[PDB]
Amino acid sequence: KPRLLLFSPSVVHLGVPLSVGVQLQDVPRGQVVKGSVFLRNPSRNNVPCSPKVDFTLSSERDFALLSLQVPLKDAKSCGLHQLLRGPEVQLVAHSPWLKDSLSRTTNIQGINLLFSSRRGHLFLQTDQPIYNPGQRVRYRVFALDQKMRPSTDTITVMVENSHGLRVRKKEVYMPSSIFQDDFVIPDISEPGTWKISARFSDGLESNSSTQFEVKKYVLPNFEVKITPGKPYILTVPGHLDEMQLDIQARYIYGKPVQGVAYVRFGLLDEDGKKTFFRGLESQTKLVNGQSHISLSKAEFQDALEKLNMGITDLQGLRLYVAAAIIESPGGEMEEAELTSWYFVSSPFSLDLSKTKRHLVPGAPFLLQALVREMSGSPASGIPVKVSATVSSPGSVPEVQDIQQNTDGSGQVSIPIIIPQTISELQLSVSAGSPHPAIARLTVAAPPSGGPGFLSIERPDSRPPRVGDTLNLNLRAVGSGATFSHYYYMILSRGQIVFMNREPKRTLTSVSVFVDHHLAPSFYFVAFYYHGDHPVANSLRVDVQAGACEGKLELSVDGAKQYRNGESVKLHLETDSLALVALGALDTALYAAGSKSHKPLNMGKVFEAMNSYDLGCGPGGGDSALQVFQAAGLAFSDGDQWTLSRKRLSCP
Amino acid sequence: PTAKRCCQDGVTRLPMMRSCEQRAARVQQPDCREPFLSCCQFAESLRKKDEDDIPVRSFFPENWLWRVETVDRFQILTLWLPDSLTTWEIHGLSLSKTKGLCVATPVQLRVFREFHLHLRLPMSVRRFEQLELRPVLYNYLDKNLTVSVHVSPVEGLCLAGGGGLAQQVLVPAGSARPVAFSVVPTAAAAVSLKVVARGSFEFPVGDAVSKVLQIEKEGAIHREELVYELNPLDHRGRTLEIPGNSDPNMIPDGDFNSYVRVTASDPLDTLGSEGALSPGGVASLLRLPRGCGEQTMIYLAPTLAASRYLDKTEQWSTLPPETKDHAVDLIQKGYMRIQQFRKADGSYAAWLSRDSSTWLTAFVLKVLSLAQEQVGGSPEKLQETSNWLLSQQQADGSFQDPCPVLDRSMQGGLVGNDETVALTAFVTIALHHGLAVFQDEGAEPLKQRVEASISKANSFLGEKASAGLLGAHAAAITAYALSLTKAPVDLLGVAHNNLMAMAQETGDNLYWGSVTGSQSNAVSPTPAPRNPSDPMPQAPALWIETTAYALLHLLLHEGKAEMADQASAWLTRQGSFQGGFRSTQDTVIALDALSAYWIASHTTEERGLNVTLSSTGRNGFKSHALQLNNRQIRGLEEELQFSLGSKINVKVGGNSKGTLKVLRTYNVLDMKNTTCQDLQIEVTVKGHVEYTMEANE
Amino acid sequence: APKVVEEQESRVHYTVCIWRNGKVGLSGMAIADVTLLSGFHALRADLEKLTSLSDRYVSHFETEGPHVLLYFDSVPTSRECVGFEAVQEVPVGLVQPASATLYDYYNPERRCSVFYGAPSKSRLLATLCSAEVCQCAEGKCPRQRRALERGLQDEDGYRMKFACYYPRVEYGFQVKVLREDSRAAFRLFETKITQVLHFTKDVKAAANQMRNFLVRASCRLRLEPGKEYLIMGLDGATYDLEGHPQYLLDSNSWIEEMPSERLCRSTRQRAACAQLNDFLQEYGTQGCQV
Ligand SMILES: *[C@@H]1O[C@H](CO)[C@@H](O[C@@H]2O[C@H](CO)[C@@H](O[C@@H]3O[C@H](CO[C@H]4O[C@H](CO)[C@@H](O)[C@H](O)[C@@H]4O)[C@@H](O)[C@H](O[C@H]4O[C@H](CO)[C@@H](O)[C@H](O)[C@@H]4O)[C@@H]3O)[C@H](O)[C@H]2NC(C)=O)[C@H](O)[C@H]1NC(C)=O
Ligand SMILES: *[C@@H]1O[C@H](CO)[C@@H](O[C@@H]2O[C@H](CO)[C@@H](O[C@@H]3O[C@H](CO[C@H]4O[C@H](CO)[C@@H](O)[C@H](O)[C@@H]4O)[C@@H](O)[C@H](O[C@H]4O[C@H](CO)[C@@H](O)[C@H](O)[C@@H]4O)[C@@H]3O)[C@H](O)[C@H]2NC(C)=O)[C@H](O)[C@H]1NC(C)=O
Ligand SMILES: *[C@@H]1O[C@H](CO)[C@@H](O[C@@H]2O[C@H](CO)[C@@H](O[C@@H]3O[C@H](CO)[C@@H](O)[C@H](O)[C@@H]3O)[C@H](O)[C@H]2NC(C)=O)[C@H](O)[C@H]1NC(C)=O
Ligand SMILES: *[C@@H]1O[C@H](CO)[C@@H](O[C@@H]2O[C@H](CO)[C@@H](O)[C@H](O)[C@H]2NC(C)=O)[C@H](O)[C@H]1NC(C)=O
Ligand SMILES: *[C@H]1O[C@H](CO)[C@H](O)[C@H](O)[C@H]1NC(C)=O
C-alpha cells in the first residue's frame, strides 16, 4: 500500500532548525506528490508554530531531508512558550495526496514531539577553583551554537552564594562570543560552595553552570601526603594481605619534617559514615621526613572482632587512614586523611554498556567490553575471555570460547556467531588472568513471528577515528524476501545528518566517512519495507578520537635567567585565526586529590556537545518502532505511530 | 545536634586563663551550656598532660596570565618567573570562527633554581628603632655553596660600613642558613632594601631580593580638622586669619604640614568623582573600618544619593565617563556585601549567624528599596523583608528590636521612650519606601497590611509627639516620618512646631541637638555670638543625624526657603576634611538630606568665589590665588600645604558662599586629658613565658 | 653542656581590657584599635577562638597592617579583659611604645586613647647592632660632655667657635635641672633657667623661668637632676603646656655641665674655668663679633 513516511528527531529545540525527513514508499512508477511540512500546537487550536516548507517527491526521487527552522516569535505567536517546561508540539506533513489518492481520513499525518527551549553550548570557568573570603574571583563565559561555532546572541549571567541567594546578575551582549567579569568574595562570607550560572537571554532552559568553593584560610607549616603501596586492597578470600602505606611530610620550602606521625585506621562507607578502631593506633618517628607502615592480618582480625564484623563484609567499604603528625622542634600538629583505599573484588572492572541487548538469528552478535583499572585509566593489553552458551530449542546447546586483548581505549569487541534457530544467549565474561573480574549477561531471542529481520553488519570492530571511513554491510535476514531498496540515515547529536537509499547486492555495503560532524558518537539507522510492515535495525558508533577540529598546542621553549628570577618563552600554536584563552594553576591543589572540580578538558566538551543525543541504548531492538525511538527518532507512516517522549532523560 | 559543637567548644583552649564556671557564663543558652560545661569540667581537672572536615590547604597564588590572546598562525609570549615553589599547569583553550573550539593539553612549568634567597621584612618600623635582618639562604644542590652576601647601600639607614661590607656564608648541601645584617633607620620614609648574594670564585651563581621597608615617625598619630565659613556677601567675612598649631604633646623632630582645601562647589565635591563617586566611594573617605552589616550600606545609599542628584539635575556630562562605571560597581559591591547577612525568613542580623535586628532589617529594606531605581527587578526578597517587619509591631503601634544595632539617646529617664519612638519612626520610613517596590496588580494584602501598619504607627508617633517629652532626635525622625507618609495634618503640625521649638540658630546656621533646657547664660533668645572669622565648631554624630532628618522634614514641609538654607549651610560645614561625616549612620542620612536639598536648590546660573591665601612657612613666604565657581568639581586634586606651626591669612571675594576646611595631622608624645572620660581601655603585654608561668599552676 | 642561647621569633602575650566609666545605660558598638609593637603580628588562630567559640567574647576582628581591630557589641561597666598571642617574624630591638584607642563606633566623640610599651627587662628594649651601625645611630645624638671637658680638636676658643662660627648657635641658656619624666619614645627634662645668654624665638625668656628640653629615647644623653648645665642649640617648633617654647637636643646642641668651685680652684682647671667665664661674659653682652 502506497504511503508517506515522516521522520524527525524526538524532541524540538527552539531556535534550532529541525531536520525533518520525508520518504515516499510503494508508489506507482510515474507518481509525483508535492506537499508541505510544518509544526503546530495541539495545546491551543492548531496554529502553526513555525514556517512551512514545501517538498516534491517522485517515484524515482522519493526522499528529501528538509531543514525546518523554529524561531522564537512563532513559538510565542502560537501560545506555547515561557515558564511551563516540557510541552508537546505536533509536526505534521500536509498534502492532498493522503485524501485524494489513499482516501485517508484527512490530509495531514504527523507525530507528537517534545519541546525544549534549550539551545547552544555555554562554557564558563573561574580563574581559581577554590577561594578564601576577601579574594577576587575572575570568570569567563564562552557561547557557541549547536554546530559548535561561536554565537553572537546575548546571554544572562547570575551568581548565587552558599545559601542560594542571587547575589550578582549581569546581562551582556556577545559581539566577540566571550564574556569576562570579576567580583570580590565578601570578607565576612560563610564557607561553602558558590555557583555561577549562565544562559542565553531568550533560551530560558539553556542554562549551564560552574561552581567553586569558598572556605576558611588554611596555610600550614608543611604539607602531608599519604601514599598506599597499593591504591586498592583485594577482597578475595585467597589474598587479603596487601595493606601497606608510605607517609611523607616536608616543608613548603622543601625541608623534611622531623617529628612523630600517628596513623589511626578505620572503615569508610557510602556517603562517608566514619567508623574506626578505638584500640589500634600506630606511631612512628619520621626518618628523612618519611615513614613506612604495615597492618598485620592478626591486628586486622582483632579489629574486625572489636567492630563485631560490622554489617556483613568489607566488599562495599574502603580502608580509612587518618594521619596526625606533630613536629618535634615546633610542637605543632598537622592532619591528613586518605579516603580512596577501596576494597576491590579485582583491580580491573568490566563494563558491557556498548553491547546490544537484542539478537539477530543467523547474524553475528558483538560482545563489546570495556576494562578500566582502579580509578585511574582504562586497562590496555589485559586479556578478556568470553564464554558464550547458545540456547537452541530441542537441539545441542553449543558453547563458544574466545579471548581478546584490550587495546587503544581499553576495549574488546568479540563477535559471537548466532545460529539461525536460537532461544537465548547465556553470556559470561572474565577479564584478567590472575584475578577474576567477571560480568554476565543474558540476551533473549526475538519472536518467531514478525515481518523479518535486518542485519547491519560491522566487519571492522575497531572504534573509528575522525578521518577514517567505516564500512557497514547490510543484509536482510531469514524470512524476508521480495523488496527493492535499503533505506538508511545517519543520526549525530540531536539531528538527522544524512539520509540515502541503497540498491541491494549479493553483499550490500555502505561506507561512512567519519568527519567532525559525527563526533563524538553517531547512530546508523537502516530499514526496509516488507509489504506494509517495516523491518529496521540500528547500531551506535562511538568515535574514539579526542582530537580537535582545529588544533591548539602549547610548548615552552628556551629559557634565560639574570638572577632576579628567570624567563622562558611560551609558544601558542594553532590552525586558523582564533581567540586563545589562557590560565596558570598551582598543581598543589589537584595533587592531593580533593574534589572532582577538574578544569575544562576536551573530554568534557565532547560530553557536553553529546548532551543533545536523543538516543537510548546501544542499538535498536525487536520492533521497528522500538528501533527508531531507541535511535532517537519520531516516526509515522499514517498507520503506525511513535509515542512522544515523556522525559528528556533516558528511561 | 548542636550539643556536639557545644561539647567541642568546651574542650577547646582559650587564650585567656578561664575556669569553666566563668567561661560558661558567656554562652547564655541552656541546651548548649549543659554539654559545654560538662565537657569543660572533664577537661579542666580530670584531663591531664578531625571529627568532621579536614584542614586542606586553601591559599593559592592568583592565576597569572588569566587573559585572552588573538592568535593567528602562532604567537610567542615571554614569561618571567621568580623561583617557583610549586609546579604550574599552563592551560589554554581556543575559540575560532572557522573550526570551532579546542582545549589544549596542559604543559607543566617549574623553575627549580639551585640557589634561592628569601628576605622577610617587618610590616613597619619607627625611626631609630634597631632591627637585625635575617635573609635566609637556601641551597638545593647536593654540594656545599659558599656565597658572598651583602646589603646594598641606601641613604637614611645605618648599614654596616655604609652597605659595602660583605659576609662569606657557607650554605651546606640541601639545607638553609640565615645571615644577620643589623640596620638602624634614621629617617622616616619608604626605603628599598636590596640584599645581594654572589658566589665567590667557587660557582658563578647569584640571587637578589628587593623589598620596601616602611619607616614611620615616632609615637602615635593625631588628627585635628576644622572648617571655616567663606562668605563675601557679609562684609565681616571677607578676610580671616587661621592661627597655627601649638599642641604641647607634639613630636619635635620633623616638620609637619597643615593641609587646606577650598571650594565653591560643595555638591559636586561631595557627590562627584572626587567624592561619593570616587572609585573607592565614601567607604574610602571615612576613617572607620566597615566589617559590620550596617556599614555595608555606605556602599549603596551614598552612591544612590549621588546618583539621584546627577540624574535629576542633569549633569552627568560634567563628570568623566568613568564615574557611571564607578557607581554601578559600588552598588553591586554593596548589594553583594549585605546579602550575606540575610537570614532565611527575610530578616538581617548585625553579624553572621547572630540574632536578628529589627532596626537593621528596616534599614536594609529602606536602602535596597531605593536601589531598585537602577538595579531593580527583585521584589520577592524585599516583600519577604517587609512582611517580617510587620511581625515586630507591638499592640502600641510601635516596633520592638531584641538586639538593636544603634543606641544613641542620652536623656535619662526618657531614654526608653526616645529609643522606642526613634526605632518606630525609622521603621515607618523604611516601610513607606517598601511600597514603591511592588507596583504589581496583585499581591495587595501585603500592600494593605503595610498601609495599615504605617497608620497605626503614625498614631503612636502622634501621641508621643503631641505629649512633647521627646528628645531632639526622636522628634527629628518623627517629624520626617509624619511628613513623608502624609500623616493627618493635625499630627503633622504638632510634630513640626515641636521640632522647630528645639532649634538652635547662629548667624547663617540652624541646627539641633542637646537642648534639654537653657544651655548657655550669655545668649540672646534665638541667635548666638558667632562670626565668620571664627571656626565652625564640629558637632557630634548625633547632631548631624538629627539635623539631617530635620532638613529632610523641612524639604517635604516647605521646600527651599530660609530654614532649609540655614540647616543645609550648617551641614555642608560639618563634613570632615576628606569627605563624609563623623560615622556611617550620620554620613548616610546627611548625604540623603543634602542630596534632596541640592536637587531642589539647584540653579544653572554661575556664581563665583575669589580666595587668596598666604603664609610664611619653612619654605618661606607663599601665596595662592584661586578663583572658584559652582560648576567646578574639585577636591583632593588641589590640597594646599603650609607649615603646621605658622598661621595662614586668607581674603575672600565674589558673589557666592563657599567653604574652607583645614586638616592638621601630626604625631604626639602624650594623650592629654580630654579623653578617657566616658570610656576606658588598658593594654598590657606580659611576655609569653611569663604569662605561661602565671597560667600553669 | 650549658648553652648561651637566643631564639628566633620572640613571642609575647597581649591583654586588652575595656570598661565604661559612666553609669548610663547607653552602650552601643565599639572598636578597640590596638597598634602593635614594631615587627609583631597577632596570631589569627588565637583571634578566631575569641569570636567563633560558643563562649564568644570579641564579636569580630580585622588584622590590617600593624593594627589589630576588635569589634565589641557593648562596652561593659566592669573591667573585662580579652587576650591573644603575638609573635615577631623579624627581630626589631629598642622597641618604642605604641598606642591603642577604644571608641564608640556611632559616636566616635566617646573614646579613650592610651600608650603602652614592651615589658621592662626584656630583649625588646635592648639594642642589637654591630659597633659601626650603633655608632652611626649615635651620630644624630647630642654632644654630651663633662664639666670643662676639652677634646683633641678643640682649638682653645671652642665655645665661642661653636656659638658664632660652626655650626653657629641660635639660643643659649644656663639652666638647673628639676626632673626628668618619660614620654612616648622621648625623654624631656624640666629645667630652670639660671642665666640667659642669647635667644631668638624665645623672646620672653628670662632668668628663674621654667623651660623644657627633650631628647630621644635612643640617645646616650640624660641631664642629671639637681645639676646645672650650659646648653645652647637651634630653635624648635614645639611649645609646652603654658605656651613657652620647647627645645630639642641634637648634634647641633652644646651640652656641658657647669664646674664646681672645687673643680675651678683645682690647679688642673684654673685656666679652663677662667676661659669659660671669659666666654660667658663676652657672649652674654657683646654677642657674635660686634
Ligand atoms: C660541607 O659542609 C658540611 C657542613 O659544614 C661539612 O661537614 C663536615 O664534614 C666533616 C668531614 O669532612 C666532619 O668532620 C667531623 O667533625 C667532627 C666534629 O669535629 C669538630 O671539631 C673539629 C676540631 O676538633 C673541627 O675540625 C670540626 O670542624 C668540628 O667543628 C669530628 O669529631 C670528626 O672526627 C671523628 O670522626 C672521624 C671519622 O672519620 C675520625 O677519623 C676522627 O678520629 C674522629 O673520631 C670529623 O672530623 C664535620 O663534622 C662536618 N660538619 C658538621 C657540622 O657535622 C663538609 O665537610 C663540607 N664539605 C666539604 C667538602 O668540606
Ligand atoms: C589637661 O589638658 C589641658 C589641655 O591640654 C591643659 O590645659 C592647659 O593648662 C595650661 C595651664 O593652666 C594653660 O595655660 C594657661 O592658659 C591660660 C589661658 O590662656 C588662653 O589664652 C591665651 C592667649 O591669651 C592662649 O595662648 C592660650 O592657649 C589659652 O587659649 C593663660 O591665662 C595662662 O597664662 C597665665 O600663666 C602664665 C604662666 O606663664 C602667665 O605668663 C600669664 O600671664 C597668665 O598669668 C596659661 O598660659 C593652657 O592654656 C591649657 N590648655 C588649653 C588648650 O587651654 C591642662 O593643664 C591639663 N591638665 C593638667 C593637670 O596638666
Ligand atoms: C539549569 O537550571 C535549572 C533550574 O533553572 C536546573 O534544574 C534544577 O536542578 C536541580 C538539581 O537536579 C533540581 O534539584 C533541586 O534544586 C534546588 C535548587 O534549584 C534545591 O533547592 C533542591 O533541594 C533540589 O536539589 C531542581 O529541581 C532543578 N530545577 C527545576 C526548576 O526543576 C539545572 O540543573 C540547570 N542545569 C545544569 C546543567 O545544572
Ligand atoms: C574674581 O572673580 C571674578 C569672577 O567672579 C572675576 O571677574 C572679572 O573681573 C574683571 C576685572 O578684574 C572684569 O573685567 C571681568 O568682566 C569679570 N568677569 C565677569 C564674568 O564679569 C575677577 O577677575 C576675579 N579677580 C581677579 C583678581 O582675577
Ligand atoms: C531661635 O532660637 C530659639 C531657641 O529657644 C527658638 O528655637 C526659636 O524658634 C529660634 N528661631 C527660629 C526661626 O526657629
mmCIF file of C-alpha atoms in Angstrom, chain B residues 417-614:
data_model
loop_
_atom_site.group_PDB
_atom_site.id
_atom_site.type_symbol
_atom_site.label_atom_id
_atom_site.label_comp_id
_atom_site.label_asym_id
_atom_site.label_seq_id
_atom_site.Cartn_x
_atom_site.Cartn_y
_atom_site.Cartn_z
ATOM 1 C CA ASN B 417 10.668 56.448 75.308
ATOM 2 C CA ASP B 418 13.143 58.108 72.929
ATOM 3 C CA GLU B 419 14.516 54.813 71.602
ATOM 4 C CA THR B 420 11.079 53.239 71.118
ATOM 5 C CA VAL B 421 9.880 56.287 69.168
ATOM 6 C CA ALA B 422 13.147 56.642 67.239
ATOM 7 C CA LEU B 423 13.042 52.982 66.192
ATOM 8 C CA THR B 424 9.338 53.149 65.312
ATOM 9 C CA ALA B 425 9.741 56.316 63.238
ATOM 10 C CA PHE B 426 12.728 54.731 61.479
ATOM 11 C CA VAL B 427 10.805 51.549 60.633
ATOM 12 C CA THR B 428 7.904 53.665 59.353
ATOM 13 C CA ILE B 429 10.257 55.415 56.915
ATOM 14 C CA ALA B 430 11.538 52.034 55.726
ATOM 15 C CA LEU B 431 8.039 50.596 55.285
ATOM 16 C CA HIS B 432 6.981 53.677 53.304
ATOM 17 C CA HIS B 433 9.849 53.158 50.840
ATOM 18 C CA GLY B 434 8.850 49.485 50.658
ATOM 19 C CA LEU B 435 5.568 50.451 48.972
ATOM 20 C CA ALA B 436 7.428 51.673 45.868
ATOM 21 C CA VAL B 437 8.966 48.218 45.316
ATOM 22 C CA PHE B 438 5.743 46.479 44.234
ATOM 23 C CA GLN B 439 3.562 48.366 41.770
ATOM 24 C CA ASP B 440 2.045 44.983 40.873
ATOM 25 C CA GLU B 441 -1.629 44.480 40.097
ATOM 26 C CA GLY B 442 -1.761 41.602 42.591
ATOM 27 C CA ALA B 443 -0.197 40.941 45.998
ATOM 28 C CA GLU B 444 -2.330 43.684 47.566
ATOM 29 C CA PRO B 445 -2.763 42.027 51.010
ATOM 30 C CA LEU B 446 0.858 42.960 51.724
ATOM 31 C CA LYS B 447 0.141 46.468 50.425
ATOM 32 C CA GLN B 448 -2.951 46.733 52.638
ATOM 33 C CA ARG B 449 -1.141 45.432 55.728
ATOM 34 C CA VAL B 450 1.821 47.795 55.406
ATOM 35 C CA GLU B 451 -0.582 50.693 54.810
ATOM 36 C CA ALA B 452 -2.474 49.692 57.957
ATOM 37 C CA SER B 453 0.759 49.194 59.914
ATOM 38 C CA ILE B 454 2.012 52.672 58.978
ATOM 39 C CA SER B 455 -1.268 54.314 60.019
ATOM 40 C CA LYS B 456 -1.220 52.607 63.424
ATOM 41 C CA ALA B 457 2.441 53.538 63.920
ATOM 42 C CA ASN B 458 1.797 57.159 62.922
ATOM 43 C CA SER B 459 -0.952 57.333 65.550
ATOM 44 C CA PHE B 460 1.582 56.129 68.122
ATOM 45 C CA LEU B 461 4.069 58.750 66.913
ATOM 46 C CA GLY B 462 1.375 61.426 67.079
ATOM 47 C CA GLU B 463 0.636 60.799 70.756
ATOM 48 C CA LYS B 464 4.291 60.940 71.819
ATOM 49 C CA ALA B 465 4.953 63.976 69.610
ATOM 50 C CA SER B 466 1.928 65.851 70.987
ATOM 51 C CA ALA B 467 2.890 64.936 74.562
ATOM 52 C CA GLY B 468 6.167 66.727 73.897
ATOM 53 C CA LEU B 469 8.533 64.944 76.295
ATOM 54 C CA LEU B 470 10.670 63.536 73.466
ATOM 55 C CA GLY B 471 14.325 64.299 72.884
ATOM 56 C CA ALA B 472 15.606 66.178 69.866
ATOM 57 C CA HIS B 473 16.479 63.005 67.946
ATOM 58 C CA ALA B 474 13.107 61.287 68.366
ATOM 59 C CA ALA B 475 11.243 64.421 67.278
ATOM 60 C CA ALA B 476 13.559 64.782 64.269
ATOM 61 C CA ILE B 477 12.701 61.354 62.842
ATOM 62 C CA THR B 478 9.040 61.666 63.857
ATOM 63 C CA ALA B 479 8.632 64.999 62.057
ATOM 64 C CA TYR B 480 10.123 63.470 58.905
ATOM 65 C CA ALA B 481 8.134 60.231 59.207
ATOM 66 C CA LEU B 482 4.821 62.071 59.589
ATOM 67 C CA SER B 483 5.557 64.410 56.673
ATOM 68 C CA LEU B 484 6.874 61.578 54.486
ATOM 69 C CA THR B 485 3.886 59.250 54.934
ATOM 70 C CA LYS B 486 1.439 62.208 54.825
ATOM 71 C CA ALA B 487 0.031 61.656 58.321
ATOM 72 C CA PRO B 488 -3.035 63.660 59.445
ATOM 73 C CA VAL B 489 -2.290 67.381 59.236
ATOM 74 C CA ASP B 490 -3.064 67.861 62.934
ATOM 75 C CA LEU B 491 -0.466 65.223 63.827
ATOM 76 C CA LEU B 492 1.871 66.657 61.184
ATOM 77 C CA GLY B 493 1.666 70.183 62.581
ATOM 78 C CA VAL B 494 2.256 69.445 66.264
ATOM 79 C CA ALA B 495 5.382 67.423 65.451
ATOM 80 C CA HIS B 496 6.736 70.146 63.151
ATOM 81 C CA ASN B 497 6.317 73.019 65.616
ATOM 82 C CA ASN B 498 7.603 70.887 68.500
ATOM 83 C CA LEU B 499 10.695 70.190 66.386
ATOM 84 C CA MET B 500 11.198 73.851 65.431
ATOM 85 C CA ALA B 501 10.851 74.975 69.067
ATOM 86 C CA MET B 502 14.028 72.984 69.860
ATOM 87 C CA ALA B 503 16.118 74.534 67.073
ATOM 88 C CA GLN B 504 19.328 76.422 67.828
ATOM 89 C CA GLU B 505 20.409 79.207 65.477
ATOM 90 C CA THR B 506 23.635 81.140 64.988
ATOM 91 C CA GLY B 507 24.388 83.552 62.152
ATOM 92 C CA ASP B 508 23.575 81.746 58.901
ATOM 93 C CA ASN B 509 23.292 78.314 60.556
ATOM 94 C CA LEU B 510 20.381 76.329 62.001
ATOM 95 C CA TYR B 511 20.919 73.056 63.855
ATOM 96 C CA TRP B 512 19.528 70.731 66.521
ATOM 97 C CA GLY B 513 20.958 68.713 69.384
ATOM 98 C CA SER B 514 21.254 68.628 73.192
ATOM 99 C CA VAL B 515 18.562 71.131 74.146
ATOM 100 C CA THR B 516 17.047 69.852 77.393
ATOM 101 C CA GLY B 517 16.852 73.399 78.793
ATOM 102 C CA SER B 518 18.804 76.646 78.683
ATOM 103 C CA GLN B 519 22.312 75.671 77.578
ATOM 104 C CA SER B 520 24.171 78.991 77.954
ATOM 105 C CA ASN B 521 23.909 82.084 80.139
ATOM 106 C CA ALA B 522 25.038 84.819 77.715
ATOM 107 C CA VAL B 523 22.992 84.060 74.581
ATOM 108 C CA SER B 524 20.184 86.132 73.104
ATOM 109 C CA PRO B 525 16.777 84.438 72.615
ATOM 110 C CA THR B 526 17.423 82.872 69.204
ATOM 111 C CA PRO B 527 20.903 83.739 67.793
ATOM 112 C CA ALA B 528 24.365 83.380 69.336
ATOM 113 C CA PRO B 529 27.725 85.189 69.139
ATOM 114 C CA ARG B 530 29.481 83.532 66.194
ATOM 115 C CA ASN B 531 31.018 85.395 63.254
ATOM 116 C CA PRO B 532 32.661 84.147 60.033
ATOM 117 C CA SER B 533 36.186 84.829 61.338
ATOM 118 C CA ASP B 534 35.623 82.109 63.969
ATOM 119 C CA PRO B 535 35.716 78.417 63.006
ATOM 120 C CA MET B 536 32.612 76.283 62.774
ATOM 121 C CA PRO B 537 32.617 74.092 65.908
ATOM 122 C CA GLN B 538 32.474 70.442 64.896
ATOM 123 C CA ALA B 539 29.331 68.735 66.246
ATOM 124 C CA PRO B 540 28.920 65.144 67.465
ATOM 125 C CA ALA B 541 27.424 62.483 65.225
ATOM 126 C CA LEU B 542 24.052 62.771 66.978
ATOM 127 C CA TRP B 543 23.663 66.423 65.960
ATOM 128 C CA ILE B 544 24.419 65.692 62.296
ATOM 129 C CA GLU B 545 21.877 62.855 62.224
ATOM 130 C CA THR B 546 19.142 64.945 63.862
ATOM 131 C CA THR B 547 19.788 67.993 61.672
ATOM 132 C CA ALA B 548 19.774 65.813 58.548
ATOM 133 C CA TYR B 549 16.346 64.433 59.460
ATOM 134 C CA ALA B 550 15.072 67.931 60.261
ATOM 135 C CA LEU B 551 16.402 69.203 56.925
ATOM 136 C CA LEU B 552 14.683 66.327 55.110
ATOM 137 C CA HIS B 553 11.490 67.168 57.007
ATOM 138 C CA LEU B 554 11.783 70.846 56.043
ATOM 139 C CA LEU B 555 12.102 69.986 52.343
ATOM 140 C CA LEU B 556 8.880 67.955 52.457
ATOM 141 C CA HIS B 557 7.131 70.518 54.669
ATOM 142 C CA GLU B 558 8.022 73.663 52.686
ATOM 143 C CA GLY B 559 10.714 73.166 50.045
ATOM 144 C CA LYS B 560 13.701 75.552 49.863
ATOM 145 C CA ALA B 561 13.162 78.757 51.955
ATOM 146 C CA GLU B 562 15.380 80.084 54.746
ATOM 147 C CA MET B 563 15.046 77.237 57.256
ATOM 148 C CA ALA B 564 16.281 74.701 54.701
ATOM 149 C CA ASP B 565 19.015 77.099 53.554
ATOM 150 C CA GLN B 566 20.362 77.665 57.070
ATOM 151 C CA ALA B 567 20.145 73.975 58.004
ATOM 152 C CA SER B 568 21.936 72.793 54.856
ATOM 153 C CA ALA B 569 24.589 75.500 55.243
ATOM 154 C CA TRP B 570 25.411 74.107 58.688
ATOM 155 C CA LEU B 571 25.518 70.522 57.400
ATOM 156 C CA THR B 572 27.850 71.308 54.491
ATOM 157 C CA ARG B 573 30.194 72.935 57.032
ATOM 158 C CA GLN B 574 30.111 69.909 59.365
ATOM 159 C CA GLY B 575 31.573 67.459 56.852
ATOM 160 C CA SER B 576 35.012 66.064 57.568
ATOM 161 C CA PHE B 577 38.082 67.160 55.635
ATOM 162 C CA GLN B 578 38.264 64.322 53.096
ATOM 163 C CA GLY B 579 34.522 63.745 52.813
ATOM 164 C CA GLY B 580 31.897 62.056 54.946
ATOM 165 C CA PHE B 581 30.903 62.964 58.476
ATOM 166 C CA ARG B 582 31.517 61.524 61.947
ATOM 167 C CA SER B 583 30.461 57.910 61.324
ATOM 168 C CA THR B 584 28.405 55.738 58.974
ATOM 169 C CA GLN B 585 24.857 56.459 60.172
ATOM 170 C CA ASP B 586 25.269 60.237 60.255
ATOM 171 C CA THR B 587 27.028 60.160 56.872
ATOM 172 C CA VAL B 588 24.334 58.190 55.036
ATOM 173 C CA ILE B 589 21.470 60.293 56.414
ATOM 174 C CA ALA B 590 23.226 63.631 55.873
ATOM 175 C CA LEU B 591 24.127 62.715 52.291
ATOM 176 C CA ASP B 592 20.483 61.802 51.666
ATOM 177 C CA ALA B 593 19.441 65.118 53.223
ATOM 178 C CA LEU B 594 21.973 67.223 51.309
ATOM 179 C CA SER B 595 21.181 65.410 48.044
ATOM 180 C CA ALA B 596 17.475 66.210 48.384
ATOM 181 C CA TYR B 597 18.283 69.853 49.163
ATOM 182 C CA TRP B 598 20.809 70.184 46.328
ATOM 183 C CA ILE B 599 18.291 68.884 43.776
ATOM 184 C CA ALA B 600 15.693 71.405 44.962
ATOM 185 C CA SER B 601 18.061 74.388 45.290
ATOM 186 C CA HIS B 602 19.996 73.876 42.042
ATOM 187 C CA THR B 603 20.362 76.726 39.554
ATOM 188 C CA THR B 604 22.003 76.942 36.137
ATOM 189 C CA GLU B 605 23.454 80.429 36.669
ATOM 190 C CA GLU B 606 27.150 80.727 37.510
ATOM 191 C CA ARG B 607 28.280 82.305 40.778
ATOM 192 C CA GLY B 608 31.952 82.515 41.697
ATOM 193 C CA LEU B 609 34.429 82.990 44.523
ATOM 194 C CA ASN B 610 37.908 84.519 44.680
ATOM 195 C CA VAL B 611 40.185 83.357 47.507
ATOM 196 C CA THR B 612 43.758 84.492 48.173
ATOM 197 C CA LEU B 613 45.700 82.534 50.800
ATOM 198 C CA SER B 614 49.161 83.349 52.130
#
